[PDB]
RNA sequence: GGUGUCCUAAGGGGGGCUCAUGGAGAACAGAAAUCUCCAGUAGAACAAAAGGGUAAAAGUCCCCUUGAUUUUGAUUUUCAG
RNA sequence: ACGUACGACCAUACCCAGUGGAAAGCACGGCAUCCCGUCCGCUCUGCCCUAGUUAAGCCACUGAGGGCCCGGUUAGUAGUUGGGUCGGUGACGACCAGCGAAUCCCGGGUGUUGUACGU
């Protein structure tokens, strides 16, 4: 028998579009955004961390009724402005991206005429409150040593109050419930990658050249990584809004509109579709 | 620009629901221009929002905590219907009526614990449930059984299931009494 | 304006005995020096909550750490009757230990930087003797 | 577009199966044979339904299997095709492009006979994929493989003939 | 309820002294216009957290039989419904249904003006966050009638719709959106529903200067058919329960500031 | 319902996975054992008695708790030689 | 306009197949020391972003067959409440009304959209 028939198609209920695309966990999202301990009617921020093959995407997001709003965004390709040119998806680049996003959020808020009702109703015994946000990892697996926690670590060091525990950091030991901050510092400054460079340079030179061809070409040794990442942290904390210009082709907005419409294929009209239908009917008759 | 408006009749408030009632008429212009109509409605909305913000910021206690600057709100006073009736006491069961008549006091929570001290083994054990004392001896290696009990015992049945049998009988009696009370309470 | 501290920034382990003294660097809060009962002093990078240097060489509890007013030296005083001066940018001890006390050294005080003469700094140490 | 390097047929995995049908020492010895052949710990399969005719019970271990990937799968497939003399039937190849066969003795692969273990037969099943199979397997943005990217029976028979120099009858 | 999860569900559905926030079920009849569906979508957007939505067509006429509404409320634990329909006589109708103990307490028809309806997407402004309660303003002389009428019932239902979750405290940053309903007594009066976002400006005083900016939706209603409550059912529904945290006052007995019980003699 | 057995109990939280069935394949293996792929809106399982229960789960397996009914209350109701 | 990250409506978006895709981005990909996890580095996790490739994912267009979504018609019609209001002893037959369907048929369509960063 035919399972996929007319009754099956009529009774089929589609999922949500992003569930069909495999991009959103709505079960997690509902508890992330629609649900809170306190009912003080306050806005909530989530730090969205996403990863590609060649980039790290960090955003500060609020949820509204017609779509999410991005308060601030930082990407790991903008680390070239601060001097990091290779390894833009490693755990340390995740740390630097989180630090950049934290400094950008604080600089946008001014914590580095229209005014707020908090300033209107502020009392004498009031203190500055930290910016608070909750982590959103998406579909990533939250195992010990993952890079979502590197981003969250960088943002918390940058000054965003993110509620977390330290048990998912690299160097954490389950048996002793103790964190090896030596291993944590090694991972922050990229010493795991540098140790891999030394290990490959000692054991397998061909794999060393193939994996780190760009490091060798740009003369980035293993021992320079710690000072490189520390200087990047300092430059991020100094100038969080430094402008970075890519090597991609640069046109204006309307020039890109024209360029893409030169390659867009037009929708066939009713007259053309009817003409093609009549041509098909004539071909079937002939 | 002023922060206080003047109208012939004062606003009333219900700050529990963040509600402001303006009993003054909204003199909507009798024109067909959507722009002036929505401008007039926006002015009415602005006046209501202004008096609501002033009332909240002046007659509610303000506390600055780590969460933020919070206004303490009064309980709501606008009468709104409930979704379900107010809970009522359940109908009195046969046991509850008997205990009320005989002056039987409810057992304390310490008295009714699922715990007892076995002297002979010198350990603490549960009175019932998994590995409870009501099933004592069903897993012991050696059990003395009287010959009269074996003579009166039906074939196939063992002594290792007698305690489960009497537990099942007591559970059945308690369930029958519970179902009888449920039916009587549903009849009432 | 200084705002009141409200939450934990970092909990950094690494000392094996109680912490007996702590002091930030005069330059910035990025560097912190702690002296403990495990016979060591430690520099901490407080930006990332990480250890920076572990200063070893005392054989008693490090009762005091003290930065020089310009921030170029760190002095530690211990119960082994000694005072040691360290370079905080490399974690290495400057010259040898300072000997001459008979009992435990309890407190340190640097000479103010506008009073330094003869091309050197002066350090006062108070002891149980 | 058929000459694209990303459409090259390759072995996804080779699954070796022994369905002894009885739990205990026989199943343990079959697991030992699978351990010696592969080099990795096997999987005990539990029976789904109780069949009185077969003498099996629900939640009773009756079979054992090993999934092998990489060049180890290629060398085990080479060993099995050496046993079968590189001759297969047209029925052995599926419509989805996978294939497989079976042997009745595990010794003639090249394992020395041990009387404490004995005699066992196996089912070999080889799965065939192209590069890009991650699309239907990854957790985020899982989707279907395109129809042109799917492997057919004629293609896998052609690949088998020009890879192993075998004969399909 | 043998399973603990089903026992939890039954305990959530049980009557309580302090009731849960009411849930609204959004549903439509066999014939329902696109304007009516858009209005239902805007109301659901304003009330996402405490609403459930049906997606099929229901052969239900609420002012003839409401047994299906009673069944749906009992099954979904939804004490409010917004029901959409369309006729030649009534082209765009939103029927607000409020119930008590899974039986219809009261009902009211709203007729939506199609030429003046603007959705939330037709205003390019920053929208309300999900789950955040707006403040409410009810303006005009239609709501102060000495006798209960359609406008009083409409005000009660709109307050019950937009009230959200009650709380004893509110953050001052959660005072950014207002819902304004305007209606005057008198040919048929028009109930106008508007939503605005609120910005604050300096005025040289302690109090800020409030300026409003339209958020949407823009709805115009004419009040239609009405189903009034049974008086005994209404008395039962308007009974109020006293929480245990509300002390029953005893004569000459008080609690001082240190928590001691104090007796007064004369 | 009656017997005879087995269990570090149920529950709770978190994580991973997807079911019944059909088609085509694989020594014994043959309608019915296990394994592989494709298709499968749930047509399985679990709760209830939907006229819209649940699918990166409310299903099923792992990890952690198993502490078998906590403490406080000038408050609610009943009682207290 | 195109792409990506979050989204909103949740099939006009789904089921099947073909053709094309500048730029960049996604993606497939390469390697398993370290973090981490499997019977299997399949998935998950880490490192590389070099090299290959648009084959697939993705996007656009096209095509059948379903399905789905709008508007009209059905039609103010069946049906149902009213001696309602007129006759009929009455039941009821018209009329006056109030609510008020669906089938069939016709016509159209096969995604719109918010924030941020880029091409």
UniProtKB/Swiss-Prot annotation, chain B:
Indicate where this protein resides in the cell: Nucleus
Q: Known InterPro entries for this protein? A: Ribosom_reg
* Residues covered by region (Disordered): 72-93
Pfam families under this entry? RRS1
Which is a Gene Ontology cellular component entry for this protein? nucleus
A Gene Ontology biological process noted in the UniProt record is: ribosome biogenesis
Question: So which domain of life are we looking at?
Answer: Eukaryota
Q: Just give the chief location class.
A: nucleus
Keyword entries, A-Z: Nucleus, Ribosome biogenesis
Q: Which family does it belong to?
A: Belongs to the RRS1 family.
Chain's role: Involved in ribosomal large subunit assembly.
Binding partners and assembly = Component of a hexameric 5S RNP precursor complex, composed of 5S RNA, RRS1, RPF2, RPL5, RPL11 and SYO1; this complex acts as a precursor for ribosome assembly.
Q: What is this protein called?
A: Ribosome biogenesis regulatory protein homolog
Protein source organism: Chaetomium thermophilum (strain DSM 1495 / CBS 144.50 / IMI 039719) (Thermochaetoides thermophila)
Q: What is the lineage of its organism?
A: Eukaryota, Fungi, Dikarya, Ascomycota, Pezizomycotina
UniProtKB/Swiss-Prot annotation, chain C:
Q: Where are the WD repeats?
A: 14-54, 57-96, 100-129
As for subcellular location, the record says: Nucleus, Nucleolus
The organism's superkingdom is given as Eukaryota
Q: What does this protein do, in the record's words? A: Involved in ribosome biogenesis. Required for processing and efficient intra-nuclear transport of pre-60S ribosomal subunits. Interacts with the AAA-ATPase Midasin, which is essential for the ATP-dependent dissociation of a group of nonribosomal factors from the pre-60S particle.
Q: Which family does it belong to?
A: Belongs to the NLE1/RSA4 family.
Q: How does it assemble?
A: Associates with the pre-60S ribosomal particle. Interacts (via WD repeats) with uL18. Interacts (via UBL domain) with MDN1 (via VWFA/MIDAS domain). Interacts (via WD repeats) with NSA2.
Q: What is this protein called?
A: Ribosome assembly protein 4
UniProtKB/Swiss-Prot annotation, chain D:
Q: What is this protein called?
A: Large ribosomal subunit protein uL5
Q: Does the keyword Flavoprotein apply?
A: no
Cross-referenced Gene3D superfamilies: 3.30.1440.10
Instruction: Summarize the subunit comment.
Output: Component of a hexameric 5S RNP precursor complex, composed of 5S RNA, RRS1, RPF2, RPL5, RPL11 and SYO1; this complex acts as a precursor for ribosome assembly.
Briefly state the protein's biological role: Component of the ribosome, a large ribonucleoprotein complex responsible for the synthesis of proteins in the cell. The small ribosomal subunit (SSU) binds messenger RNAs (mRNAs) and translates the encoded message by selecting cognate aminoacyl-transfer RNA (tRNA) molecules. The large subunit (LSU) contains the ribosomal catalytic site termed the peptidyl transferase center (PTC), which catalyzes the formation of peptide bonds, thereby polymerizing the amino acids delivered by tRNAs into a polypeptide chain.
GO function terms (MF aspect)? structural constituent of ribosome
Source species, domain of life = Eukaryota
> Which Pfam families does UniProt cross-reference here?
Ribosomal_L5, Ribosomal_L5_C
GO BP field: translation
InterPro entries to which the protein is assigned, alphabetical = Ribosomal_uL5 (IPR002132), Ribosomal_uL5_C (IPR031309), Ribosomal_uL5_CS (IPR020929), Ribosomal_uL5_dom_sf (IPR022803), Ribosomal_uL5_N (IPR031310)
Keywords, A to Z, come to: Ribonucleoprotein, Ribosomal protein
- Indicate the family of this protein: Belongs to the universal ribosomal protein uL5 family.
**The keyword Ribonucleoprotein is annotated on this UniProt entry:** yes
Q: What are the record's GO terms for cellular component?
A: ribonucleoprotein complex; ribosome
UniProtKB/Swiss-Prot annotation, chain E:
**What's in the GO CC field?**
nucleolus
**What terms describe the molecular function in GO for this protein?**
rRNA binding
Q: Does the keyword Nucleus apply?
A: yes
Looking at the record, the residues that make up the Brix domain are 22-232
The cellular location(s) given in this protein's UniProt record come to: Nucleus, Nucleolus
The UniProt keyword set, sorted, is:
Nucleus
Per the record, the similarity remark reads:
Belongs to the RPF2 family.
User: Can you state the subunit structure given in the record?
Assistant: Component of a hexameric 5S RNP precursor complex, composed of 5S RNA, RRS1, RPF2, RPL5, RPL11 and SYO1; this complex acts as a precursor for ribosome assembly.
Q: What is this protein called?
A: Ribosome production factor 2 homolog
Give the species.
Answer: Chaetomium thermophilum (strain DSM 1495 / CBS 144.50 / IMI 039719)
Output the lineage of the source organism.
Eukaryota, Fungi, Dikarya, Ascomycota, Pezizomycotina
What fragment of the whole protein does this chain represent?
7 to 300 of 350
């Amino acid at each position: 028998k035919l399972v996929k028939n007319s009754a099956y198609y009529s009774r089929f209920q589609t999922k949500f579009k992003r569930r069909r695309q495999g991009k959103t966990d709505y079960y997690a999202r509902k508890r992330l955004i629609t649900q809170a301990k306190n009912k003080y009617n306050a806005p909530k921020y989530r730090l969205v961390v996403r990863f590609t093959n060649r980039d790290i995407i960090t955003q500060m997001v609020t949820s509204e009724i017609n779509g999410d709003k991005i308060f601030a965004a930082a990407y790991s390709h903008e680390l070239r402005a601060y001097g990091i040119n290779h390894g833009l998806t490693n755990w340390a680049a995740a740390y630097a991206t989180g630090l950049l996003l934290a400094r950008r959020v604080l600089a946008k808020l001014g914590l580095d005429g229209e005014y707020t009702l908090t300033e209107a109703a502020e009392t004498e015994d009031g203190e500055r409150r930290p910016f608070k946000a909750i982590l959103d990892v998406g579909l990533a697996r939250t195992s010990t040593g993952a890079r979502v926690f590197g981003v969250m670590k960088g943002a918390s060091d940058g000054g965003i109050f993110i509620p977390h525990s330290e048990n998912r950091f690299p160097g954490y030991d389950i048996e002793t419930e103790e964190l090896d901050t030596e291993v944590l510092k090694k991972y922050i400054y990229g010493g795991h990658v540098a140790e891999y460079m030394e290990t490959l340079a000692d054991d397998d030179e061909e794999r060393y050249k193939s994996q780190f061809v760009k490091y060798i070409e740009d003369d980035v040794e293993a021992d320079s990584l710690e000072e490189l990442y520390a200087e990047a942290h300092k430059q991020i904390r100094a100038d969080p809004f430094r402008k970075y210009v890519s090597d991609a082709p640069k046109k204006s907005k309307e020039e890109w509109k024209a360029e893409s419409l030169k390659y867009k294929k037009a929708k066939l009209s009713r007259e053309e579709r009817k003409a093609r239908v009549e041509a098909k009917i004539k071909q079937l008759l002939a | 620009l002023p922060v206080t408006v003047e109208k012939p009749t004062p606003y009333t408030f219900d700050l529990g629901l963040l509600l402001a009632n303006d009993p003054n008429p909204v003199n909507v212009p009798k024109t067909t221009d959507t722009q002036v109509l929505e401008q007039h409605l926006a002015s009415v909305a602005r006046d209501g929002a202004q008096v609501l913000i002033n009332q909240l910021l002046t007659t509610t206690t303000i506390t600055a905590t780590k969460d933020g600057v919070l206004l303490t709100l009064p309980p709501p006073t606008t009468p709104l219907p409930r979704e379900k009736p107010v809970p009522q006491p359940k109908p009195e069961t046969k046991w509850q009526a008997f205990a009320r008549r005989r002056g039987i006091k409810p057992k304390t929570r310490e008295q009714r614990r699922n715990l007892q001290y076995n002297p002979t083994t010198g350990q603490w054990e549960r009175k019932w449930g998994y590995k409870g004392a009501n099933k004592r001896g069903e897993t012991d290696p050696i059990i003395e059984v009287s010959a009269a009990k074996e003579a009166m015992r039906p074939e196939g049945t063992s002594v290792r299931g007698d305690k489960r049998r009497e537990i099942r009988a007591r559970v059945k009696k308690n369930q029958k009494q519970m179902l009888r009370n449920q039916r009587i309470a549903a009849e009432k | 304006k200084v705002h009141a501290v409200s939450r934990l920034a970092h909990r950094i382990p690494g000392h094996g005995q109680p912490i007996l003294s702590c002091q930030f660097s005069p330059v910035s809060s990025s560097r912190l020096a702690t002296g403990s009962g495990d016979n060591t002093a430690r520099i901490w990078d407080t930006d990332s909550g990480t250890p920076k240097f572990t200063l070893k060489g005392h054989t008693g509890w490090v009762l005091g750490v003290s930065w020089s007013p310009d921030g170029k030296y760190l002095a530690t005083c211990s119960m082994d009757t000694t005072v040691r001066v360290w370079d905080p940018e490399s974690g290495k001890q400057v010259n040898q230990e300072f000997r001459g006390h008979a009992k435990w050294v309890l407190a340190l005080a640097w000479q103010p930087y506008h009073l330094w003469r003869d091309g050197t700094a002066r350090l006062a140490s108070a002891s149980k003797d | 577009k058929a000459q694209n390097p990303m459409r090259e047929l390759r072995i996804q995995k080779l699954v070796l199966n022994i369905s002894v049908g009885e739990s205990g020492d026989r199943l343990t010895r079959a697991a030992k044979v699978l351990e010696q052949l592969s080099g990795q710990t096997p999987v005990y399969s539990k029976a789904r339904y109780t069949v009185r005719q077969f003498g099996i019970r629900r939640n009773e271990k009756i079979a054992v299997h090993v999934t092998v990937r990489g060049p180890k799968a290629e060398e085990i497939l080479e060993r099995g095709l050496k046993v079968k003399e590189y001759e297969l039937r047209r029925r052995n190849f599926s419509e989805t492009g996978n294939f497989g066969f079976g042997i009745s003795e595990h010794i003639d692969l090249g394992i020395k006979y041990d009387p404490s273990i004995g005699i066992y037969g196996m089912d070999f099943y080889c799965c065939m994929t192209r590069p890009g199979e991650r699309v239907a397997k990854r957790r985020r943005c899982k989707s279907r493989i395109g129809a042109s990217h799917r492997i057919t029976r004629e293609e896998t028979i052609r690949w088998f003939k020009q890879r192993f120099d075998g004969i399909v009858r | 309820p043998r399973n603990a999860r089903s026992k939890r569900a039954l305990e959530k559905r049980a009557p309580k002294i302090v009731e849960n926030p009411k849930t609204c079920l959004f549903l439509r009849g066999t014939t329902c216009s696109q304007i009516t569906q858009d209005a239902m979508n805007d109301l659901y957007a304003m009330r996402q957290v405490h609403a459930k939505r049906f997606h099929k067509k229901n052969a239900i006429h609420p002012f003839e039989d409401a047994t299906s509404l009673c069944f749906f409320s009992e099954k979904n634990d939804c004490s409010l419904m917004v029901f959409g329909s369309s006729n030649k006589k009534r082209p765009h109708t939103l029927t607000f249904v409020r119930m008590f103990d899974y039986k219809v307490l009261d009902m009211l028809e709203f007729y939506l003006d199609p030429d003046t309806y603007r959705s939330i997407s037709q205003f390019k402004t920053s929208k309300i966050p999900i789950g955040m309660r707006p403040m409410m303003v009810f303006a005009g002389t239609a709501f102060e009638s000495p006798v209960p009428n359609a406008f009083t019932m409409a005000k009660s239902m709109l307050i019950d719709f937009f009230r959200g979750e009650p709380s004893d405290k509110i953050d001052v940053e959660g005072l950014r959106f207002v819902v304004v309903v305007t209606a005057d007594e008198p040919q048929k009066p028009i109930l106008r529903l508007r939503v605005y976002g609120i910005r604050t400006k300096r005025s040289g005083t302690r109090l800020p200067r409030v300026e409003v900016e339209e958020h949407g939706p823009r709805m115009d209603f004419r009040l239609g058919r009405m189903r009034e409550p049974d008086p005994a059912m209404l008395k039962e529904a308007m009974k109020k329960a006293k929480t245990p945290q509300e002390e029953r006052t005893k004569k000459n007995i008080s609690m001082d500031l240190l928590g001691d019980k104090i007796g007064r003699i004369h």
